[PDB]
Design a protein around this ligand. Structure first.
Ligand SMILES: O=[N+]([O-])c1ccc(O[C@@H]2O[C@H](CO)[C@@H](O)[C@H](O)[C@H]2F)c([N+](=O)[O-])c1
Ligand SMILES: *[C@H]1O[C@H](CO)[C@@H](O)[C@H](O)[C@H]1F
Length: 394
């Protein structure tokens, strides 16, 4: 259904839909604020569902699931010249741990989305975005500040969830739509046992192929250096249809934030050069237009922005308030953003393509493909260049 040698992925993530993220849908979290006090705001989906209870959580989420993304979005995506979506989903859509606060129902909408994809000639990855115990401690795993995916029976439960996903979506029924199943979003390499993570990836690869599925297996790079995965799941060992997912940002440290625009572009270009050297097919499955970490709650509920020296002992660089509304942006900031987007697009099209995070947000413009396109900052058509050939690829 896809030719990873000859085709380029031009896609968007459908984030904030089946896994809640406070910075993406702040309207669902803000009712818990007490004036300016954020101390009682639930920090993740786990705590949000727990605080509301099962009945209120399901009422509110059904409304969200039914309106956040609809068939109309899929038509707009196709109209904009995109060919692909990545769909994050948590483990709790399929299986609950004993005493999990989560509610279910996401699968009905996942299956509607697969039909909407088919109808609009859009291909899909399904991405297991949160594992039991958390694989990274990020709020977008479902459970912040916990790192227990490799503890207890949590890895085994994750494999059971993947087998369900494999039997449902890795078979003949969706072979014209599903071009990859991503085993686990962003396992936090530095705090995990890498040998056990490799064993988990291998078990997932083998279990899918044992079902008779030919669907590509997508592995996230676990924040390892370029080339780390070259010798893993290789054709020499009869392992095939494997894609590496690299994610790229320049906003989650003080050092990255303090770079001038020219150095931001140099780093983006180098992502392209380095990915070209790798031995697996590879796709940039997550990236954005952000040059700041100013979006409210990007770093988590009740955490501030490094950009204005309010988090992670970062020095003050600039005030976030002026950057929260795209209509208040300076001419210089608009230009820098367009340059940065174009450099990233050229770098990512130099290998398998790109998947922008995300299609939409309530009010965070750096992270919304819609908002950027409508304001002329994301190229439309996506091949248009105001700053051609910044990287000099050959
Ligand atoms: O050490 N690391 O491998 C690593 C990984 C992700 C890191 O950054 C993480 O990036 C994610 C996007 O990939 C964000 O969702 C998280 O909020 C952020 F903590 C950082 N960090 O905080 O600078 C370090
Ligand atoms: C990739 O990173 C973005 C930004 O931190 C998150 O919103 C996603 O859930 C994660 F997958």
């Amino acid at each position: 259904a896809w030719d990873y040698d000859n085709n380029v992925i031009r896609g968007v993530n459908l984030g904030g839909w089946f896994v809640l993220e406070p910075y993406m849908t702040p309207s669902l979290f803000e009712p818990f604020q007490n004036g300016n006090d954020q101390s009682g705001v639930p920090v993740d989906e786990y705590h949000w569902t727990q605080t509301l209870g099962k009945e209120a959580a399901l009422r509110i989420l059904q409304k969200h699931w039914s309106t956040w993304i609809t068939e109309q979005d899929f038509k707009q995506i196709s109209n904009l010249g995109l060919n692909f979506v990545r769909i994050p989903i948590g483990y709790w859509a399929f299986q609950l741990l004993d005493n999990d606060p989560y509610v279910q129902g996401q699968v009905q909408y996942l299956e509607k989305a697969l039909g909407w994809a088919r109808k609009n000639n859009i291909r899909v990855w399904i991405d297991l975005h949160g594992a039991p115990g958390s694989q990274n401690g990020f709020d977008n795993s479902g459970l912040r500040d916990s790192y227990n995916f490799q503890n207890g029976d949590n890895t085994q439960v994750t494999l059971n969830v993947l087998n369900t996903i494999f039997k449902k979506y890795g078979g003949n029924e969706y072979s014209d739509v599903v071009i990859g199943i991503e085993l686990l979003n962003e396992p936090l390499g530095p705090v995990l046992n890498m040998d056990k993570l490799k064993q988990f990836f291998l078990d997932g690869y083998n279990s899918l192929r044992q079902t008779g599925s030919v669907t590509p297996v997508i592995i996230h790079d676990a924040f390892q250096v370029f080339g780390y995965w070259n010798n893993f799941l290789t054709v020499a060992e009869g392992q095939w249809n494997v894609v590496v997912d690299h994610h790229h940002y320049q906003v989650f440290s003080g050092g990255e934030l303090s770079r001038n625009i020219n150095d931001h572009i140099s780093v983006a270009c180098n992502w392209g050069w380095d990915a070209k050297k790798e031995s697996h097919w590879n796709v940039a499955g997550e990236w954005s237009a952000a040059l700041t970490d100013c979006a409210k709650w990007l770093n988590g509920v009740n955490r501030g922005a490094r950009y204005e020296g309010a988090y992670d002992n970062a020095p003050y660089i600039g005030s976030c308030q002026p950057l929260l509304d795209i209509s208040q942006w300076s001419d210089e900031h608009k230009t820098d953003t367009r340059r940065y987007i174009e450099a990233q697009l050229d770098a990512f099209e130099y290998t398998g393509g790109w998947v922008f995070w995300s299609w939409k947000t309530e009010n965070a413009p750096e992270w919304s493909f819609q908002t950027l396109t409508y304001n002329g900052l994301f190229p439309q058509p996506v091949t248009d260049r105001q700053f051609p050939n910044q990287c000099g690829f050959h």
